[PDB]
Design a protein around this ligand. Structure first.
Ligand SMILES: CCCCCCCCCCCCCCCCCC(=O)OC[C@H](COP(=O)([O-])OCC(O)COP(=O)([O-])OC[C@@H](COC(=O)CCCCCCCCCCCCCCCCC)OC(=O)CCCCCCCCCCCCCCCCC)OC(=O)CCCCCCCCCCCCCCCCC
Ligand SMILES: CCCCCCCCCCCCCCCCCC(=O)OC[C@H](COP(=O)([O-])OCC(O)COP(=O)([O-])OC[C@@H](COC(=O)CCCCCCCCCCCCCCCCC)OC(=O)CCCCCCCCCCCCCCCCC)OC(=O)CCCCCCCCCCCCCCCCC
Ligand SMILES: CCCCCCCCCCC(CCCCCCCCCC)(CO[C@H]1O[C@@H](CO)[C@H](O[C@@H]2O[C@@H](CO)[C@H](O)[C@@H](O)[C@@H]2O)[C@@H](O)[C@@H]1O)CO[C@H]1O[C@@H](CO)[C@H](O[C@@H]2O[C@@H](CO)[C@H](O)[C@@H](O)[C@@H]2O)[C@@H](O)[C@H]1O
Ligand SMILES: CCCCCCCCCCC(CCCCCCCCCC)(CO[C@H]1O[C@@H](CO)[C@H](O[C@@H]2O[C@@H](CO)[C@H](O)[C@@H](O)[C@@H]2O)[C@@H](O)[C@@H]1O)CO[C@H]1O[C@@H](CO)[C@H](O[C@@H]2O[C@@H](CO)[C@H](O)[C@@H](O)[C@@H]2O)[C@@H](O)[C@H]1O
Ligand SMILES: CCCCCCCCCCCCCCCCCC(=O)OC[C@H](COP(=O)([O-])OCC[N+](C)(C)C)OC(=O)CCCCCCCCCCCCCCCCC
Ligand SMILES: CCCCCCCCCCCCCCCCCC(=O)OC[C@H](COP(=O)([O-])OCC[N+](C)(C)C)OC(=O)CCCCCCCCCCCCCCCCC
Ligand SMILES: CCCCCCCCCCCCCCCCCC(=O)OC[C@H](COP(=O)(O)OCCN)OC(=O)CCCCCCCCCCCCCCCCC
Ligand SMILES: CCCCCCCCCCCCCCCCCC(=O)OC[C@H](COP(=O)(O)OCCN)OC(=O)CCCCCCCCCCCCCCCCC
Ligand SMILES: CCCCCCCCCCCCCCCCCC(=O)OC[C@H](COP(=O)(O)OCCN)OC(=O)CCCCCCCCCCCCCCCCC
Lengths: 87, 494, 81, 37, 186, 558
């Protein structure tokens, strides 16, 4: 239930935000944690170590994609000098 | 290598020689025009050889070559009476179209000749294919060469014209394609010899009819779907216009014989009163409209609309006379409309640079050879006897009157208005005062080239107008196969 | 008129022709003339290969049709009861 | 984050002016012939 | 039968709710600070229009069903006619009223006649090989079936046409049929 | 083999900083992918709906292996763009086989062939290229929910990297940001859909999910609503990655901003892997009995997107003036056709799906190849047009506007005809391969009762044809704005070329000009083969169409 509310918070990050692109990166991190938390709790209910394994690979991949996204942001910011959307 | 496949191969060799001869000789443009002309001449020579060997009373498709290496999309060619004369008309017309532009292209001559030669192979393929999908593939393949012909060699408004003829034809053909795909799904095949053997259910026939008729109405064209013809046939180069009016208009007519009369006879019988209302409306509205048209080629283009309505009414008459009249009128309109476009788009437009009728007057005084042929073509466009135009109009209108008298009478009224707009145009150009005061320079009369592409066209219509049997003899048995009905005492002999 | 080798020999010949036209290079210069046999030779090789593929495809499709009438038969015979 | 000359409706408006399709009134064009006196 | 008013309210609510969704996005994408109450102030017209089309559409088809006492494709096109008309009324242009009515009524009618698979086509649940084979080889049919669809005459003169022809003329005109002999000897 | 090549290339790449190695590394990647084709050609000698591999986490089908090879062949063709210089010098005195294979030619090539162009100096470009391929082929062969997620991220993250690898272009970094940010949101929906399957079913195995679906399709306590709803959320994320409407806004911006050579790979490879993956998942989840399951079938999201893509792709393309945005919208309309064929789950539509995907990939490849070749050809031409001067990233995207193609028929008539053939294949004019692709999809949709969608497909096709015609009109109806460069042919501006034998001894010395500078053979030949496949398909259709027929029979084999 908490995991569902957290997914909304990550969803709501995209609704409320017109100009903060950094918040877009953070809202993906919230969504991914919410989905991993749901898998972890379900894996506990169904006594299944595969759920924990799936969550570990989501942490690995979401950590890997955070680094790519920050690198892409750095290449973007090197040329623009701002992460602000003019709106 | 069947004679029919030879027909499609010669124009492709001409394309090869046209586009490679510079690697063997700066080559002169006259060379390209001579390669292209001889190419079409040998194609005409082959079609004449086929006609000598053609048999007038065979229900088998003739000069077919066995493939037996079946694939998904194979090209089978064959000819019978209903297709033999359309093939001949295509082979006669295209050399005349080439000569009609001999001097008036002057740029991108290689592209013009390659496009013209490719159009011949495609249009011939349309009349020769023995499969309904094969029919569609060639009916549509001509749009991109047609689109690029107008844009490369057309007049000032050729951009709007090329778009109109492309999008009208595609949109209608897409509805014909839907109808064709339904047929192949039910039957498993679109080959003529086995699709005609099948029997579609009435409501299937009804919905198959709308899909096909929507395409054939855009291509006839019927009135209200004819904007593309007004634009394309006028903005096109003269050769394009001749091919567009004398060959391309005929594909929907030949397509009624292969796509609706044999498989959709119940739908055709039950919907004739809708075809005839549209056919009657087109005869009147077009005739009144061309009476007020001020562009000479658009007036001549608009006449094609009125005559196409008459042979469209003939093919739906279910009578022997209407169907023979429809092919004979479609053939007759091919020669006469070709001559009238040469007179307007070739003779007048090259001398003056304009097509407005306001600027022409008294041309007979300085140009008596142009007026002599122009009058004979204005008589033929009016359906005067001893032209193949009368034999076709009378037989087409007789079938229309017998099938449904109210439409026959209205379609009959075209005897007045065809004469009306044809002679009125003729007088405002050849007669009607002395030579127009707008001409500063005097004009020369027909050149030898102009005389002989008109004499040839007026010879074909007149000889066929005195002895139409040359064509009717090869239509009697095949036309009989497309009739739907039975007599009380002849049906079911025992 | 669908011969695999004749068509694909010509296809390779047409590829060279279109290529030279695209480069706006002369179609027949005598020192380059070895290329048309080469292009048509490789084209002929592709079509001998397509021959063998078509043979195996025909056998496999023919085998599938038998399995389809076979399935319809034993279903229809089971319905006879 | 992209320039106007690549995504702006402004360049589309230049490439396809609304003026290219003449709209008028019975006042200035009663005969619907384009204002032809 | 069906409740025309009740169905229209459900019709008005369902497609008006999406308009309320699209209205909130406009407010969210609004640039100047207009607050949260511009959902019904600046974009309330948008949501109102949606609730009107959906109400007009579901009312009339249900109404057309009651008037015709039938359920077929005609009712959705009729439903789409007023649905299309309602949208045109917002622009205040008569050609917009007719054209959008024509557009909507046509698409929504061919959608019901054809039965677009957007929710799923109907499964025949039969040997689909057999239906094709029957349609493929039904190459000759009893003459009566054709006579029902195409009728008599117009060149379709089955054996026995002349006998019934006289009977029909006698019943309508009261005139006996008897062509005169063309031979003086007879 | 793809994994050995990636590791081996990386090790060789790790210990070098020389940007002149970039062209060589690209060629080795072509050689490496050729071995990958060989190993997968070896693997097709079996008939099976599927063989689970490697502990059941992967699987192999005849379909899977056919499309591994297709992905490899498309990647080899695209890799030519970074493996051969765009222009060459040709002369009749160096055209014999004895010349090309025993003699050498010498001239100042650097400026002529653009030896130091940006697309020839990125060492790691072929390596990131192979990483995307690995994600694509792993996604095809994926049999498990976790394998699905890992493969889609592997392919997706590589595509973000490729969109940004031109790190000095403001356009490319901007496009990389947009794809990553919206692509990362799309990946949450895929992970959310996969997770909802696991939490309800208790398995990550696609086999087990199909078994659960199959028994639940009967005609109480644990009614399986989760499967359709989860796959609906799962599918939405995959609709973003194929740029299907209404999830398509990102692609016209990303495709235009990133360099054209990058756009070629990015806009082609990803659709093939996702669509093929979706095809199997559509088949095994397709309910037979008309029960409560079929009414909530997730595949309506595919049918709605096909409808929305048919309209958006054709209507919005009407006003595009930039050539790469038009291609992006032209693609959206074509995935509309592809998604219709995937949604109708018939034998006919699956054959149509398989054929349409391959022929569109080949055709879209040709359009990009022709567009890059026209850009490399304008080197010997100049223009005074004020619009062209104000273009950004002219080196990365030489052709950016349709107006730049004005009178290209007078600059290179036969190359312009190849463009026209390809575009006419996009509209569906017979007897081009594009027509036959649309024809099969329409016949299959018509035979399954999809009349309304078939009618919208034909109507949107006429609208789509308008902007296709608009490209053709600029090439053929007008005289060009580009003039040949005067200083390239000025009767005294001639550069020198030496012809030398096997022993580096002089043979001849020839003075050359700009008219001796031609398009490189790899690009002209690839355009020429594909153009002739499009044009001559009606004579060569038996094997190509029989392959898909057999593939569908295996998939449908009761
Ligand atoms: C295991 C360790 C023992 C072998 C490592 C040393 C071998 C000699 C390499 C060398 O040249 O040394 C000098 C080299 C620099 O010398 P240099 O004077 O600059 O030479 C010029 C350049 O190197 C330019 O010359 P280069 O690029 O040809 O030399 C680099 C060298 C690098 O290649 C290697 O070192 C081979 C590594 C495994 C053997 O060779 C290659 O790149 C070409 C062959 C690539 C083989 C890649 C094998 C990938 C693994 C495939 C697994 C699946 C197989 C089934 O320094 C290195 O050691 C480079 C290699 C990095 C060391 C780590 C290798 C192990 C990594 C983990 C194990 C992966 C398995
Ligand atoms: C549907 C499928 C239908 C298939 C059949 C259709 C016809 C096939 C036509 C393709 C023929 C391509 C070709 O051979 O062009 C020769 C091409 C002729 O171009 P050129 O205009 O006369 O002069 C080149 C320029 O001066 C300067 O050259 P460049 O710098 O501009 O280009 C360098 C050279 C590229 O260098 C190569 O030749 C690549 C060699 C890679 C290895 C191939 C052999 C593998 C075994 C190695 C041991 O050019 C090419 O060959 C481009 C080929 C593009 C093919 C693209 C793949 C299909 C699309 O290359 C040559 O100069 C002579 C090479 C002679 C041997 C070629 C390599 C063996 C090919 C064997 C094929 C299978 C047996
Ligand atoms: C001008 C367009 C004509 C295009 C020709 C389409 C080709 C034929 C399809 C017409 C169609 C739907 C028509 C829906 C409305 C038509 C367009 C609405 C206005 C267009 C803007 C008839 O649909 C009806 O066909 C009847 C049987 O004939 C059935 O009885 C009806 O239940 C069925 O609805 C499809 O049915 C057809 O599918 C084939 C299976 O390959 C079946 O064998 C038949 O079922 C056949 O008939
Ligand atoms: C316009 C061109 C026409 C179409 C071109 C190809 C269309 C037909 C190709 C059909 C094809 C190629 C698949 C690659 C094409 C993928 C997509 C291509 C792009 C489409 C444009 C798939 O053939 C597969 O088709 C599947 C169904 O479709 C079947 O299921 C498979 O069983 C079948 O193998 C043929 O595969 C075959 O290749 C040959 C090798 O010579 C193999 O023979 C052997 O191979 C080694 C033992 O392996 C031996 O060492 C070798 O000694 C021997 O020779 C065959 O064993 C088989 O592997
Ligand atoms: C149209 C130009 C054709 C070529 C021009 C040269 C001929 C022009 C006509 C000049 C007068 C010819 C007729 C003279 C009659 C004198 C008696 C006579 O010779 O009869 C012998 C023959 C008739 O001989 P017959 O009637 O006694 O018996 C043999 C004919 N069969 C057996 C078939 C009945 O007349 C001719 O052959 C004249 C043929 C003239 C043209 C024939 C058709 C031309 C158009 C073909 C295309 C039609 C479709 C186009 C689309
Ligand atoms: C498009 C069709 C592609 C078909 C490729 C193919 O089937 O080649 C088979 C071949 C199979 O080769 P092979 O191993 O079967 O060679 C023949 C073996 N004997 C001698 C016994 C007959 O695959 C390859 O060679 C891979 C390299 C070709 C791909 C290069 C780039 C394209
Ligand atoms: C068929 C075999 C040849 C038929 C043509 C015979 C008539 C002929 O001789 O034509 C000659 C034609 C032009 O004559 P020429 O003297 O070469 O030009 C001089 C201009 N200063 O010279 C030519 O270039 C005409 C080439 C015609 C090629 C045959 C027709 C093309 C279609 C082949 C199928
Ligand atoms: C029976 C089944 C047949 C199936 C098809 C078989 C092939 C049919 C023909 C397809 C295309 C063939 C093209 C043939 C011409 C190629 C040779 C050539 O290079 O011609 C060049 C010509 C002039 O250009 P050039 O002389 O180089 O420049 C001089 C400038 N002063 O420039 C030109 O000629 C260009 C001419 C205009 C373009 C052609 C007409 C429009 C074609 C649209 C293409 C797409 C549809 C293809 C349809 C094929 C037929 C259905
Ligand atoms: C069946 C297809 C139905 C038509 C589909 C689209 C109809 C449509 O929306 O047309 C709107 C059009 C508005 O016309 P109007 O307001 O006068 O603006 C003209 C400015 N050039 O309205 C029209 O042009 C036609 C309005 C009457 C349509 C009767 C059918």
């Amino acid at each position: 239930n908490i995991t569902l509310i957290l997914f909304l918070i990550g969803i709501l990050g995209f609704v409320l935000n017109r100009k903060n692109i950094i918040l877009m990166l953070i809202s993906i991190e919230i969504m991914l944690l919410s989905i991993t938390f749901l898998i972890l709790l379900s894996s506990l209910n169904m006594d299944d170590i595969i759920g924990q394994t799936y969550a570990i690979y989501i942490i690995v991949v979401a950590g890997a994609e955070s680094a790519i996204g920050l690198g892409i942001l750095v290449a973007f910011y090197r040329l623009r000098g701002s992460i602000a959307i003019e709106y | 290598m069947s004679l029919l496949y030879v027909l499609l191969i010669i124009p492709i060799i001409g394309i090869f020689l046209i586009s490679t001869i510079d690697s063997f000789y700066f080559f002169n443009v006259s060379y390209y025009k001579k390669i292209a002309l001889i190419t079409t001449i040998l194609n005409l020579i082959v079609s004449l050889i086929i006609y000598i060997l053609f048999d007038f009373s065979n229900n088998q498709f003739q000069f077919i070559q066995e493939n037996l290496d079946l694939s998904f999309y194979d090209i089978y060619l064959g000819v019978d009476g209903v297709s033999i004369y359309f093939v001949l008309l295509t082979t006669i017309i295209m050399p005349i179209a080439l000569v009609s532009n001999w001097n008036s292209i002057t740029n991108n001559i290689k592209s013009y000749l390659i496009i013209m030669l490719l159009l011949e192979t495609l249009l011939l393929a349309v009349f020769l294919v023995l499969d309904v999908l094969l029919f569609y593939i060639f009916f549509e393949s001509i749009l991109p060469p047609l689109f690029i012909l107008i844009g490369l060699f057309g007049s000032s408004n050729k951009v709007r014209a090329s778009f109109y003829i492309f999008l009208y034809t595609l949109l209608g053909s897409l509805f014909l394609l839907l109808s064709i795909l339904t047929m192949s799904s039910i039957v498993g095949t679109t080959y003529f010899d086995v699709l005609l053997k099948s029997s579609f259910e009435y409501t299937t026939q009804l919905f198959l009819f709308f899909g096909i008729f929507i395409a054939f109405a855009v291509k006839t064209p019927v009135w209200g779907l004819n904007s593309w013809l007004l634009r394309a046939h006028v903005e096109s180069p003269l050769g394009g216009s001749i091919v567009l009016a004398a060959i391309v208009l005929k594909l929907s007519l030949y397509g009624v014989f292969r796509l609706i009369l044999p498989i959709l006879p119940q739908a055709s019988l039950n919907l004739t009163y809708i075809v005839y209302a549209i056919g009657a409306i087109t005869v009147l509205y077009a005739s009144f409209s061309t009476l007020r048209t001020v562009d000479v080629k658009e007036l001549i283009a608009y006449s094609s609309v009125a005559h196409a309505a008459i042979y469209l009414m003939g093919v739906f008459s279910n009578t022997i006379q209407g169907l023979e009249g429809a092919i004979l009128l479609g053939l007759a309109h091919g020669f006469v409309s070709s001559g009238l476009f040469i007179c307007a788009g070739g003779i007048l437009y090259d001398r003056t640079g304009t097509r407005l009728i306001y600027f022409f007057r008294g041309l007979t005084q300085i140009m008596p050879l142009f007026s002599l042929f122009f009058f004979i073509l204005c008589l033929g466009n009016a359906g005067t006897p001893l032209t193949l135009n009368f034999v076709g109009e009378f037989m087409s209108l007789y079938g229309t009157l017998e099938r449904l008298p109210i439409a026959g009478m209205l379609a009959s009224t075209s005897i007045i208005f065809s004469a009306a707009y044809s002679i009125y145009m003729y007088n405002r150009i050849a007669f009607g005062g002395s030579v127009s005061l707008y001409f500063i320079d005097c004009f020369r009369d027909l050149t030898k080239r102009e005389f002989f592409i008109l004499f040839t066209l007026v010879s074909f219509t007149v000889i066929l107008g005195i002895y139409p049997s040359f064509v009717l003899d090869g239509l009697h048995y095949n036309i009989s196969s497309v009739v739907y009905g039975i007599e009380p005492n002849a049906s079911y002999l025992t | 008129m669908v011969n695999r080798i004749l068509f694909w020999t010509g296809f390779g010949l047409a590829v060279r022709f279109w290529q030279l036209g695209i480069e706006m290079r002369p179609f027949f210069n005598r020192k380059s003339l070895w290329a048309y046999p080469l292009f048509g030779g490789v084209g002929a090789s592709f079509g001998y290969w397509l021959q063998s593929i078509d043979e195996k495809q025909t056998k496999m499709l023919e085998e599938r049709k038998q399995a389809i009438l076979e399935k319809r038969a034993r279903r229809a015979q089971r319905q006879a009861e | 984050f992209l320039p106007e000359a690549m995504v702006g409706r402004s360049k589309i408006d230049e490439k396809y002016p609304d003026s290219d399709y003449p709209t008028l009134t019975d006042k200035e064009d009663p005969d619907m012939n384009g204002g032809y006196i | 039968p069906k409740d025309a008013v009740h169905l229209g309210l459900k019709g008005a609510a369902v497609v008006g709710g999406i308009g309320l969704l699209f209205a909130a996005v406009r407010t969210s994408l609004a640039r100047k600070n207009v607050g949260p109450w511009a959902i019904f102030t600046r974009n309330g017209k948008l949501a109102a229009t949606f609730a009107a089309v959906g109400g007009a559409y579901d009312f009339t088809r249900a109404a057309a069903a009651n008037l015709r006492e039938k359920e077929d494709w005609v009712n959705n096109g009729i439903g789409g006619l007023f649905a299309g008309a309602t949208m045109g009324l917002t622009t205040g242009r008569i050609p917009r009223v007719l054209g959008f009515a024509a557009l909507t009524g046509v698409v929504l009618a061919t959608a019901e006649y054809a039965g677009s698979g957007l929710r799923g086509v109907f499964k025949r649940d039969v040997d689909e090989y057999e239906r094709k084979e029957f349609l493929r080889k039904n190459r000759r049919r009893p003459i009566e079936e054709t006579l029902a669809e195409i009728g008599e005459g117009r060149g379709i003169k089955p054996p026995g046409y002349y006998e019934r022809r006289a009977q029909r003329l006698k019943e309508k005109y009261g005139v006996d049929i008897n062509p005169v002999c063309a031979d003086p000897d007879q | 083999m793809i994994m050995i090549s990636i590791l081996s290339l990386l090790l060789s790449t790790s210990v070098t900083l020389r940007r002149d190695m970039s062209i060589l590394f690209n060629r080795i990647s072509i050689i490496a992918l050729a071995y990958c084709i060989l190993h997968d050609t070896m693997s097709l000698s079996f008939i099976s709906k599927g063989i689970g591999l490697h502990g059941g986490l992967l699987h192999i089908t005849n379909l899977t292996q056919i499309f591994h090879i297709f992905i490899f062949i498309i990647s080899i063709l695209i890799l030519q763009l970074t493996s051969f210089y765009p222009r060459k010098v040709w002369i009749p005195e160096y055209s014999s086989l004895k010349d090309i294979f025993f003699n050498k030619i010498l001239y100042y090539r650097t400026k002529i062939i653009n030896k130091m162009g940006e697309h020839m100096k990125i060492i790691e470009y072929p390596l990131i290229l192979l990483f995307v391929i690995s994600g694509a082929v792993f996604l095809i062969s994926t049999n498990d929910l976790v394998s699905i997620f890992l493969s889609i991220e592997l392919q997706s993250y590589g595509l973000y990297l490729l969109s940004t690898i031109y790190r000095n272009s403001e356009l490319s970094t901007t496009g990389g940001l947009i794809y990553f940010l919206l692509g990362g949101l799309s990946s949450c929906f895929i992970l959310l859909g996969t997770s909802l399957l696991y939490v309800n079913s208790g398995t990550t195995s696609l086999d087990g999910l199909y078994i659960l679906n199959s028994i639940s399709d009967v005609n109480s306590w644990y009614k399986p609503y989760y499967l359709n709803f989860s796959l609906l959320i799962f599918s939405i994320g995959f609709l973003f990655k194929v740029s299907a409407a209404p999830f398509h806004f990102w692609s016209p911006d990303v495709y235009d901003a990133i360099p054209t050579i990058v756009t070629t790979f990015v806009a082609i490879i990803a659709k093939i892997s996702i669509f093929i993956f979706l095809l199997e998942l559509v088949y095994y989840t397709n309910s037979n009995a008309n029960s409560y399951l079929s009414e909530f079938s997730w595949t309506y999201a595919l049918l709605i997107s096909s409808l929305l893509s048919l309209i958006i792709g054709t209507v919005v393309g009407l006003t595009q003036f930039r050539i790469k945005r038009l291609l992006a919208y032209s693609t959206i309309s074509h995935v509309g056709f592809i998604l219709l064929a995937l949604s109708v789950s018939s034998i006919e539509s699956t054959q149509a799906f398989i054929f349409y995907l391959i022929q569109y990939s080949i055709s879209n490849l040709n359009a990009f190849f022709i567009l890059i070749t026209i850009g490399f050809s304008l080197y010997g031409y100049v223009t005074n047009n004020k619009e062209y001067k104000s273009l950004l990233d002219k080196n990365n995207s030489p052709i950016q506007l349709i107006s730049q193609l004005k009178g290209y028929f007078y600059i290179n008539p036969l190359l312009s005809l190849s463009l026209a053939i390809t575009i006419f294949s996009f509209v569906g004019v017979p007897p081009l391969v594009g027509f036959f692709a649309k024809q099969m999809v329409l016949s299959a949709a018509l035979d399954n009762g999809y009349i309304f969608l078939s009618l919208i497909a034909i109507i949107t096709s006429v609208i789509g044809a308008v902007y296709y015609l608009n490209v053709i009109k600029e090439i053929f109806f007008y005289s060009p704005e580009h003039e040949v460069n005067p200083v390239l042919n000025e009767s005294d501006s001639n550069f020198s070329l030496r012809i030398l034998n096997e022993k580096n001894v002089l043979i001849r010395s020839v003075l050359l000009k700009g008219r001796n500078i031609f398009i490189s053979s790899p690009f002209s030949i690839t355009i020429s083969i594909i153009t002739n496949v499009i044009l001559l398909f009606i004579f060569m259709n038996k094997e190509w169409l029989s392959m898909g027929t057999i593939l569908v029979q295996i998939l449908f084999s009761a």
